[PDB]
């Protein structure tokens, strides 16, 4: 039910599998097959990615007003690169 995503700087993010599987890339990387290492994505980026999964799963198929997903300017470039690689 939970999987571990490890950042370049060694941070270990434990998220529900269904949340992780909103990345196609991660879905493929799971096929310690419940652990995945990201030697190119630092913790300040991977933490945001995980927040995005929570966000996506909460608000996908919701009639409630949906809030903006916030992204600080300082991480935008890296988050872009990570999002692109992760396909999410």
């Amino acid at each position: 039910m939970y999987v571990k995503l490890i950042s370049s700087d060694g941070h270990e993010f434990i998220v529900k599998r269904e949340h992780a599987l909103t990345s196609g890339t991660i879905k493929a990387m799971l096929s310690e097959t419940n652990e995945v290492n990201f030697r190119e994505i630092p913790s300040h980026v991977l933490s945001k990615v995980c927040m995005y999964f929570t966000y996506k799963v909460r608000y996908t198929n919701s009639s409630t007003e949906i809030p903006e997903f916030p992204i600080a300017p300082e991480i935008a470039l890296e988050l872009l690169m990570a999002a692109n690689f992760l396909d999410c």
Binding site: E12, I14, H19, T54, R58
Partner: peptide
């Protein structure tokens, strides 16, 4: 009402709701 958490210890972080 769901609340969304990061449970954090050392270099470990759990994302869950409760």
């Amino acid at each position: 009402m769901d609340v969304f958490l990061m449970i954090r210890r050392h270099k470990t972080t759990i994302f869950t709701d409760a």
